[PDB]
Amino acid sequence: GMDTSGKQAEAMALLAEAERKVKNSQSFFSGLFGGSSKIEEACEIYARAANMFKMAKNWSAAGNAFCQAAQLHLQLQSKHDAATCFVDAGNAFKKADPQEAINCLMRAIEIYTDMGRFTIAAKHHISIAEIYETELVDVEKAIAHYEQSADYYKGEESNSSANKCLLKVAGYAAQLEQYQKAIDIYEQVGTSAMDSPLLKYSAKDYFFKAALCHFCIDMLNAKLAVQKYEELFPAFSDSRECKLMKKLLEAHEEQNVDSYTESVKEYDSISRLDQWLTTMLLRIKKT
Amino acid sequence: MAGRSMQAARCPTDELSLSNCAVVSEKDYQSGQHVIVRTSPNHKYIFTLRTHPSVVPGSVAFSLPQRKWAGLSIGQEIEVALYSFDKAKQCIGTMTIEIDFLQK
Known part of the structure; x- marks a missing residue:
């Protein structure tokens, strides 16, 4: 829709204006010593560009703008806002450029x-x-x-x-x-x-x-270990888990794999099993 | 004589498993020597030793019946001290066995 093209064009114009402003900031400082007001204004423009890019769904451009703002404001001895911009870049690049987000979060x-x-x-x-x-x-x-x-x-x-x-x-x-x-x-x-x-x-x-x-x-x-758990936490004995482990151990004691799998299937029918427990039980069953 | 701390191991071969004797390394003991195995202050069990090279040094191998009777586990720590039977009174002259079917 209009959002894509309009946001892209306006963000490009704003980013170019910020680039020109930072380019002329060196001359302004050299000739007049304006201070850091120009740099702060440029940082504001860059943050605005990052916000527009985020609204524009161009995550990469927003993350890059946030990184540039973080670097520029870190140059200004403001580490707190630099870290804020770095975290913004990390959570913006998270989906677009995972590695860039990784280093941004590390810097933060x-x-x-x-x-x-x-x-x-x-x-x-x-x-x-x-x-x-x-x-x-x-x-x-x-x-x-x-x-x-x-x-x-x-x-x-x-x-x-x-x-x-x-x-x-x-x-x-x-x-x-x-x-x-x-x-x-x-x-x-x-x-x-x-x-x-x-x-x-x-x-x-x-x-x-x-x-x-x-x-x-x-x-x-x-x-x-079953004995130790039963003796240390007697309430645990009430749960069906102790009965299940006892039946499984009994099945293994006689190489009765069929009873093992029947018990596992019945418990799964009572309550669906998780991938981790399924893998553990299957690996045990190999023996 | 004094006794040393040792490791529990698994029986290497079926022959020695059926022999009902703990399998030990030659570097630690010798075949025919009796030992007392301590698992706790109130749990001492007397075994007779037989040698097999495969037993790793510092460990004693027991058969499944021995592990079930004495409650020994693989990797468990034990105290092993060489033992001598008092043949003047500990010799076996008569013994009774309740024989069942190991495999039902």
Whole structure:
């Protein structure tokens, strides 16, 4: 519609005007020493151009304009507004140019953490990890950023947020075929969650998952861990999870795979299963 | 004599699994030597040793029946001390067995 062409033309004109203004700013400063008013006016024009490009759906141009404004205002010794523009560029380029958004968010993280604002740095780290996982299959970078964000939030004593990041890291690690870390993280979260009335009800689930994660290591330790969980968290015994694990262990004890799959199918019929649990159960069933 | 901390391992071969004797490395013990295996202050079990090279040093291999009776697991830490039977009184003159079917 008219939006595309009109916004493109007007944004191009405004950006050219800003470019001419910044070009003449050097001469103005040399001949008269106007100060930084011209640079601030040019930065305002560039921010306006970025806003129009964002409305124009040309994400790349808006991100580039935001980056230029961030650089120019950082040259003006205003690191806070420079970081604001860098975060704008990161969240604009996120969809258009993921790599550019990555470096923009990294620069914003550096600028913010220079001031000790650990919460914003942790949020940016979480954003970077989320982008890495969603777009790329570089699990290691996502895990590193998640761990850094969890450490940042732990240093802020903000509980209930590091727990979810640690759980995500543990689940992805278990998917990566490293179970000791997953077992430890799940057990730690479960023991942190028992005392909480609200989360106690979900605690059992964590325990169950941990017990399944220890199943691959060896049967004997699986039975031992089942006993330890039953004795330490007696309420867990009431849940159907204990019965399911006991039936699965009984089926494995006699190589009775048919009973194993019948029980798994019945439980799936009762409640649909998740991809992670399905993969874990299938991998166990190979033996 | 004094006893040393050791690692639990899995039985290497079916013959020694049926022998009902813990398989050990020659560098640690020798075949026929008795041992006492401690898993806790109240849990000491007496085994007789048989040697097989495949056992990695620092570990003792047990058969599935042994692991079920003593509750031993792969990778578990134990204390192993060489043991001597008092043949003046610990010799076996009579013994009773309840024989069942291992495979139903």
